[PDB]
Scaffold this active site. Structure first.
Site, short mmCIF file in Angstrom:
data_model
loop_
_atom_site.label_atom_id
_atom_site.label_comp_id
_atom_site.label_asym_id
_atom_site.label_seq_id
_atom_site.Cartn_x
_atom_site.Cartn_y
_atom_site.Cartn_z
N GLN A 86 -97.67 10.39 59.64
CA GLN A 86 -98.43 10.91 58.51
C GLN A 86 -98.09 10.17 57.22
O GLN A 86 -97.09 9.44 57.17
CB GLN A 86 -98.18 12.41 58.35
CG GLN A 86 -98.80 13.24 59.47
CD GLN A 86 -98.48 14.72 59.36
OE1 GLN A 86 -98.79 15.36 58.35
NE2 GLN A 86 -97.88 15.28 60.40
N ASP A 131 -91.21 20.38 66.61
CA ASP A 131 -91.45 18.95 66.84
C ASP A 131 -90.18 18.13 67.07
O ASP A 131 -90.10 16.97 66.64
CB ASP A 131 -92.23 18.37 65.65
CG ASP A 131 -92.99 17.11 66.01
OD1 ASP A 131 -93.29 16.91 67.20
OD2 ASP A 131 -93.27 16.30 65.09
#
Ligand SMILES: *[C@@H]1O[C@H](CO)[C@@H](O[C@@H]2O[C@H](CO)[C@@H](O[C@@H]3O[C@H](CO)[C@@H](O)[C@H](O)[C@@H]3O)[C@H](O)[C@H]2NC(C)=O)[C@H](O)[C@H]1NC(C)=O
Ligand SMILES: *[C@@H]1O[C@H](CO)[C@@H](O[C@@H]2O[C@H](CO)[C@@H](O)[C@H](O)[C@H]2NC(C)=O)[C@H](O)[C@H]1NC(C)=O
Ligand code: NI
Length: 418
Positions: A107, A297
């Site tokens: 990201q 995650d």
């Protein structure tokens, strides 16, 4: 606005962050007390760290706090001097920015080059503090939260780990500190929204596009600023796949460790890397952190590979996908605790200390977060959640004590007889 102003630049919340009811289970508390009243934790703790040496004593520069940070990187901790680190935090927030570059490759995130030519990782703010993750979104669909990076670093210190990387909030002038300081390839991705807000698209794999552009209101943008790791050439690092890696698929959503209870016994405790040492104790430690923050995650581990002989530890990194939900506890994250049932003695005391005094954990966290210039870092609704998750952790610990015995759970080093 979907992308709001920095909360620090808004109306100050006068509400009491701890006006919630909790209270502690005294039955569970008493069972833990009884099962541990004969444990000499002081003598137990002294083996958790084999040799306590910093990077500088191992080498045998301090011109700035970056170098001062790098030098004091220890063999059993990333840092041990909060004041020096708080100085680094202040520097990360206030130091003038020379260059802004797009970071490898993930990201949207920038590399800040400061006037002293030191560097940092920048992650821009998207949604407000109240925003919660879509219940339909998988962990690999979740947008990063810059304030989660900040919050977790503080929580990592409050828990006494100090294995996280220094991160501070910072409100930037998009025009002078971002746009005018940006590389050519990044500069061209800037534009004005129909509302005349300043926006940039940047370049990355995960939705660096016009629709999901980061926008100011109109020209300021809060973000997380995290000190760069020391150069790899000088301080090499290891990248290890987690045995509790999730599937990262919407078809087969169930990994072996999620359906098989004896997974740790048969598949993790029997591996060379985990059969002897601190690695498994680290994995339990980091999953306790991830469970408290709701981080799903954790697919890989990051570790320094610079201290010869001595055992390395997992660096508490990549917390962008934490604190997504205040009303949901993912017990799958704390599964390693439940399956392995081993626990570093210091960690137990830390958890026990906070648990035995309700709201002490989140209060100690709030106080730490308050020093960050971008406070409030977390919406207060996450505080009762963290208290709720802490209590559940102690229940899993009690089950480990009663099933396998206290002498087999609370170990400073793990050794598998088989
Ligand atoms: C490993 O060895 C290092 C070498 O000393 C240890 O560091 C020292 O730890 C103490 C205890 O936390 C630190 O003390 C604190 O200093 C602050 C700032 O003045 C003060 O407010 C506190 O009341 C406390 O006195 C000390 O600063 C720190 N020294 C350095 C150079 O960082 C470390 O604790 C040992 N253990 C681990 C796991 O690293
Ligand atoms: C961010 O910095 C810019 C400076 O580039 C500020 O805008 C300036 O405001 C003055 C006010 O008279 C103008 O004379 C300048 O022409 C403006 N600059 C530009 C490039 O238009 C802006 O106000 C700052 N914003 C924040 C939130 O600090
Ligand atoms: Ni979208």
């Amino acid at each position: 606005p979907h992308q709001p102003i920095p909360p620090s630049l808004g109306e100050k919340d006068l509400s009491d962050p701890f006006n919630f009811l909790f209270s502690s289970n005294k039955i569970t508390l008493r069972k833990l007390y009884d099962l541990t009243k004969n444990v000499d934790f002081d003598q137990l703790r002294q083996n958790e760290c084999k040799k306590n040496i910093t990077l500088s004593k191992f080498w045998e520069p301090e011109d700035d706090n970056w170098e001062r940070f790098y030098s004091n990187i220890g063999s059993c901790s990333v840092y041990s001097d909060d004041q020096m680190i708080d100085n680094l935090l202040h520097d990360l927030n206030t130091s003038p920015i020379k260059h802004v570059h797009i970071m490898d490759g993930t990201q949207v995130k920038f590399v800040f080059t400061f006037k002293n030519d030191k560097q940092a990782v920048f992650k821009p703010m998207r949604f407000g503090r109240d925003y919660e993750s879509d219940p339909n979104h998988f962990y690999f669909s979740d947008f990063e939260r810059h304030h989660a990076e900040i919050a977790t670093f503080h929580l990592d210190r409050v828990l006494g780990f100090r294995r996280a990387i220094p991160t501070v909030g910072r409100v930037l002038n998009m025009t002078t500190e971002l746009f005018e300081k940006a590389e050519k390839k990044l500069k061209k991705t800037f534009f004005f929204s129909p509302a005349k807000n300043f926006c940039f698209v940047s370049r990355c794999d995960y939705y660096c596009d016009t629709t999901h552009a980061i926008c100011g209101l109109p020209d300021m943008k809060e973000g997380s600023v995290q000190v760069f790791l020391p150069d790899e050439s000088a301080v090499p690092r290891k990248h290890n796949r987690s045995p509790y890696r999730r599937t990262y698929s919407k078809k087969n959503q169930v990994a072996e460790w999620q359906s098989s209870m004896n997974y740790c016994t048969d598949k993790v405790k029997t591996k060379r890397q985990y059969a002897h040492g601190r690695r498994l104790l680290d994995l339990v430690d980091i999953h306790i952190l991830d469970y408290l923050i709701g981080n799903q995650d954790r697919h890989h581990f990051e570790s320094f590979n610079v201290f010869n002989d001595l055992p390395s530890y997992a660096i508490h990194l990549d917390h962008g996908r934490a604190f997504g939900r205040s009303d949901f506890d993912d017990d799958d994250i704390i599964l390693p605790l439940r399956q392995c049932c081993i626990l570093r003695p210091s960690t137990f005391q830390t958890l026990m200390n906070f648990y035995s005094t309700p709201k002490s954990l989140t209060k100690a966290l709030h106080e730490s977060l308050s020093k960050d210039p971008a406070h409030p870092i977390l919406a207060y609704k996450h505080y009762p959640a963290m208290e709720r998750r802490l209590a559940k952790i102690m229940s899993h610990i009690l089950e480990c004590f009663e099933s396998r015995g206290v002498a087999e759970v609370l170990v400073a080093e793990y050794n598998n007889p088989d």
